[PDB]
Design a protein around this ligand. Structure first.
Ligand SMILES: [Zn+2]
Ligand SMILES: [Zn+2]
Ligand SMILES: [Zn+2]
Length: 122
């Protein structure tokens, strides 16, 4: 009874014309820090600042008061550049278990070449 992070926090990428939408599926008994969800691209700066779905507020033993996510987290990155070429998206996030321990920040890389849904490769 303690999931590998690969199973506690599962992101799915929806690449469309307006930008990249990320949905995290979050296993029962785990939660995610809104403030630790970050997106970077190579080439850099194709994406603007993320829009976040509504979360909850929690007094946390690690980072104090925080907006967190149970069950799911939704994050939409708008396009800041015209993108016609493939690029890499590096997603950073961090979640915890309700039992009272936290996973380290995790970086997950997506190789994007056009529209559709993308899954993690490892
Ligand atoms: Zn909680
Ligand atoms: Zn798929
Ligand atoms: Zn794996």
């Amino acid at each position: 009874d303690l999931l590998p992070p690969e199973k506690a926090f599962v992101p799915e990428l929806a690449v469309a014309d307006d930008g990249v939408n990320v949905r995290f599926r979050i296993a029962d008994g785990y939660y995610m820090y809104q403030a630790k969800i970050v997106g970077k691209t190579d080439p850099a700066d194709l994406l603007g600042q993320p829009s976040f779905s509504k979360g909850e507020e929690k007094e946390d033993e690690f980072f104090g008061r925080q907006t967190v996510y149970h069950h799911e987290a939704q994050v939409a990155f708008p396009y800041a550049k015209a993108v016609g070429e493939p690029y890499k998206l590096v997603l950073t996030y961090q979640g915890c278990a309700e039992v009272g321990v936290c996973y380290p920040p995790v970086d997950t890389e997506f190789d994007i070449s056009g529209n559709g849904t993308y899954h993690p490769q490892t």
